[PDB]
Amino acid sequence: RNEEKAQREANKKIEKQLQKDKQVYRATHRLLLLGAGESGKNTIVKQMRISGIFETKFQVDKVNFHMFDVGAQRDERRKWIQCFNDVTAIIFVVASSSYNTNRLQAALKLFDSIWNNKWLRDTSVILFLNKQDLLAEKVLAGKSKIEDYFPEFARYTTPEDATPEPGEDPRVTRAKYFIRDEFLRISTARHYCYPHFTCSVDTENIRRVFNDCRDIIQRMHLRQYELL
Amino acid sequence: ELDQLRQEAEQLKNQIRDARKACADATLSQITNNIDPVGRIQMRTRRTLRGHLAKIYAMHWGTDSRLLVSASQDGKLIIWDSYTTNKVHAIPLRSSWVMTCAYAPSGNYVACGGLDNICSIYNLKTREGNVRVSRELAGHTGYLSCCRFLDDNQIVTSSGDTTCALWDIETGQQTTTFTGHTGDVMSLSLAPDTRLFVSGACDASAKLWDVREGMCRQTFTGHESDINAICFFPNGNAFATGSDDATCRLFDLRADQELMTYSHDNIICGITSVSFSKSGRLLLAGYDDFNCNVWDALKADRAGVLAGHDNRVSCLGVTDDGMAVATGSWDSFLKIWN
Amino acid sequence: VRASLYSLMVLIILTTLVGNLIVIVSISHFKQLHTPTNWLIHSMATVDFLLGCLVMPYSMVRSAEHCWYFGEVFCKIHTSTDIMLSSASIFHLSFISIDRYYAVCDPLRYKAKMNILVICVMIFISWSVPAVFAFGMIFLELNFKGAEEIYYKHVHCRGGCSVFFSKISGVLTFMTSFYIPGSIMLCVYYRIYLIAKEQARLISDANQKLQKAVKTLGIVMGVFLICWCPFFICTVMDPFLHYIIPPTLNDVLIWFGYLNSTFNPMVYAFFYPWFRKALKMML
Amino acid sequence: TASIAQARKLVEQLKMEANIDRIKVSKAAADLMAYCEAHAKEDPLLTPVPASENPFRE
Amino acid sequence: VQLVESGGGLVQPGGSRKLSCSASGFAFSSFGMHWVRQAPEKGLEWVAYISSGSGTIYYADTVKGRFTISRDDPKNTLFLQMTSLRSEDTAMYYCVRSIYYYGSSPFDFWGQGTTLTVSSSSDIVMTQATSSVPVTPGESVSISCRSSKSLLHSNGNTYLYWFLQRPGQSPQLLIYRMSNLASGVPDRFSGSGSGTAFTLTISRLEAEDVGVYYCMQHLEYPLTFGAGTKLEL
Ligand SMILES: Oc1ccc([C@H]2CNCCc3c2cc(O)c(O)c3Cl)cc1
Secondary structure, three states: OHHHHHHHHHHHHHHHHHHHHHHHHHHHEEEEOOOOOOOOOHHHHHHHHHOOEEEEEEOOOOOOEEEEEEOOOOOOOOOOHHOOOOOEEEEEEEEEEOOOOOOOHHHHHHHHHHOOOOOOOOOOOEEEEEEEHHHHHHHHHHOOOOOOOOOOOOOOOOOOOOOOOOOOOOOHHHHHHHHHHHHHHHHHOOOOOOOEEEOOOHHHHHHHHHHHHHHHHHHHHHHOOOOO | HHHHHHHHHHHHHHHHHHHHHOOOOHHHHHHHOOOOOOOOOOOOOOOEEEEEOOEEEEEOOOOOOOEEEEEEEOOEEEEEEEOOEEEEEEEEOOOEEEEEEEEOOOEEEEEEOOOOOOOEEEEEOOOOOOOOOEEOOOOOOOOEEEEEEEOOOOOEEEEEEOOEEEEEOOOEEEEEEEEEEOOOOOEEEEEOOOEEEEHHHOOOOOEEOOOOOOOEEEEOOOOOEEEEEEEEEOOOOOEEEEEEEOOEEEEEEOOOOOEEEEEEOOOOEEEEEEEEEEOOEEEEEEEEEOOOOEOOOOOEEEEEOOOOOOOOOOEEEEEEOOOEEEEEEEOEEEEEEE | HHHHHHHHHHHHHHHHHHHHHHHHHHHHHHHHHHHHHHHHHHHHHHHHHHHHHHHHHHHHHHHOOOOOOOOHHHHHHHHHHHHHHHHHHHHHHHHHHHHHHHOOOOOOHHHOOOHOOOOOOHHHHHHHHHHHHHHHHHHHOOOOOOOOHHHHHHHHHHHOOOOOOHHHHHHHHHHHHHHHHHHHHHHHHHHHHHHHHHHHHHHHHHHHHOOOOOHHHHHHHHHHHHHHHHHHHHHHHHHHOOOOOHHHHHHHHHHHHHHHHHHHHHHHHOOOOOHHHHHHHHH | OHHHHHHHHHHHHHHHHOOOOOHHHHHHHHHHHHHHHHOOOOOOOOOOOOOOOOOOOO | OOOEEEOOOEEEEEEEEEEEEEEEOOOOOOOOEEEEEEEOOOOOOEEEOOOOOOEEEEEEOOOOOOOOEEOOOOOOEEEEEEEOOOOOOOOOEEOOEEOOOOOOOOOOOEEOOOEEEEEOOOOOEEEEOOOOEEOOOOOEEEEEOOOOOOOEEOOEEEEEOOOOOOOOOOOOOOOEEEEEEOOOOOOEEEOOOOOOOEEEEOOOOHHHHHOOOOOEOOOOOOOEEEOOEEEEE
């Protein structure tokens, strides 16, 4: 029977190690990096650090974040998206400066399809807009125009609550906020969409994620306790 | 010269379907309508393996019928002693997203695959006691959905790039590559003879692949939804497929038909796991509705329920001797029903 | 009036037992409800169920014939365990409030801070500190520390085990049993109300750009206050006053406290969709 | 182009799938039922069995 | 997998010694350590045992509180503190690996060993048939072993072990439990047991079979040893 009691002792040691990594997993908020290939997602993971799945790690204010990027996937059918249900939020990263089908439409279609995904019902999206600079040397330069083949964006102006912090140019702000509310339509049409503006490289971006998460779970708790 | 190729392809496809229609004359249900035993089976749990951190996606029984392997969402493989509800081994995976695990028939190796595009081979019985990754299997451009063991050194894999692949553990190279799927392939059912195996994909068409010749012997259409699981009947001539359309489709590799469909009005969720009894008399199917309905293959209907799970039944397995059925779900608990 | 009081008090006891037993069997059985906050709620339910099956029937008889017919040693035992379980229930309320706070003030560090260990610590504190204090106040003669003739006169007021309190002991049991946990709950839940209101206003302004908190907080504080505060305020003002209070008013204040014990399952378990859904699955 | 090559490959694969054996379906059903009933007498530890037959013993 | 043992030598009566057994090339954190010693002229003997996580610790009846056993996973070392060394406390000490997951191979690997020269009931009886017999090569060899109780546990596990250690070298492992042969040793070996009497059968013989065998039980935990059958060529 001592062999069997040793089976139990090995079981107990394994379960103690499993409880340790249980604490580690509980104290960690999983994220799902998402976006297109031409986007700046890779650049972002570098700021996070400073096969098929990329297990990027980053810590903010003693909070662990496993941001998972899908490197080599078929990119035709997202059936593995069901495997992400426990993720705190999914990072949606899109290049704002598409110049003048065009990849803004493809990005919007992807965002809409992944917003309406039922596997991600209790999942909030924190959308990132990169290429603020590449937008600056395009809209301000004026080499390529947005009115050439978009019937809209002409009857739309900057909203009164828009906050142009960079203050580069009214045209740049107008185009950038047009991209913002063009993306947020789908989200406005349990979950939230957090639009953010950034360039290719930014430290505050990491902090942004933390702030976003500090809202999501909070509300997720507010809804859990009938507080919201 | 592409229009003529499409013309010939569809011509031969429809002559294949006409050959099937001529071959088929009667259904299996009316053949067996005369007999109706084991109409109601009772299998209480009596065993609940708790300890998995996160959602369980796959499990596999050992040939010894006492030992088990299961994979969890956090990236943890647990080798379980089923008889006494013990943890035999705890393997921390490099990739924190695994959706398939397999146990070698010899009992020495464990296969493990997920979103990392790799089927990792861990040696359970190394000179040292540490389960170690004896061989990573890389070469798939899509998420690896099911890698079953062919031999102690030869293995079959099924990934998210619509391509199944045979591999040799000695060299680690993809040997006799074969692809015939348009949608990605999510599960493969290995024959006991280890010379054939049937794999199901999002194409809603199962494919029978020969191990030696390494190219598609036969194709089976018939599923109205994505295929999620597949088990091969112990007799060696049939196999069942579980799908998102709540239908367990039992085909036979002989005669190129569907033997039967197992569906009901109550069940509308997807089927995530499928297995057969030792005699294949019962078809144990996992469902997304917190339930594992035990269907009776012979009685053409559901005979029993394996309810008791608090989340999606993602994986179940009948042991080789058929003594009991393990069932893993998303409530992080895997329960054995005897 | 005797029959009416007997019927109402029977209803109170039966409701306490049924609610607390339902909560206990629901938390202990379902693995979907094996969360640390649910362990706090289960400990609360156990405290209130033990209250119902130990202290309320003999106190019920005492309120029935306005006298004790059970013995002096059993008198002290009741009184001590009646203080112990009431203070344990209040402590469980306070710790549930703290847990709900840490789920909102620090949502990113909730499941790490409020693991099973800290919650078990809270349960042990709620079951032990009220125990130690109640037994020290009752058996160790710390109930009054003086005024023995006034204690006898308080006994002579009804003769049926009415507890006497000195001013220092009264204020001490007000602070420990009621005021500290009550103020903790009040401040915690005011902060929760502010946060929930700010994140409700944000959602509303976003929605109007495109174009529950009051209820829950009010329910919790209203039940807790209307059920304990009159009892404790009167019980601590009587030592400060000349003890000029009707015995019936005191007794109905004890029954209020028991009424908080009654509503405790209904405020923290049956008020939430997850527990209600689990109960529906059970039923 | 690659499209013509893949179309030709699919045509060849399915047309050499054409010349495969197709036994009678009723024969397959009879063989399946024979396998089921032959092992039904044993069908290890699934029929009504005593508690001592279980190696779980619970 | 290597075990290096250090310590021992001439010790005055009543002395204290710190025997050491270090593990090199492998990790013993999941391995149970058994302190089985070899008598210079008699069979092996067990004194102490520690679990992988030190949860369960056992000592022999003759030495219960006298010895002290410690394991250092970060340093991968085993320390055996011995006090009040009597003249009888002399043996060829070995540190033994044994992992106890289902289907494992207990007592698979043994250390190099150290010598220690010292100046001046419920225990199961484990007995073998003979002690020495001349054997010719090729013809099958049968060795008989006996126990004072039925080793067939209710779970069906008959805890019996054969080691067949050559004189003056680290003991090996031949068969454990029933009809279980370690892949290192040739398949020619086999074990047959009725439940109380047991037989070790060897189909063919070579130079490796020369030496003394050993028979152990594990139902209870006194770890009694057999007399030992010696095969000479
Ligand atoms: O003679 C007696 C009078 C009253 C009581 C109970 C009343 N019900 C609530 C419990 C309680 C009591 C008294 C306290 O002073 C106290 O602090 C608490 Cl919590 C018991 C015996």
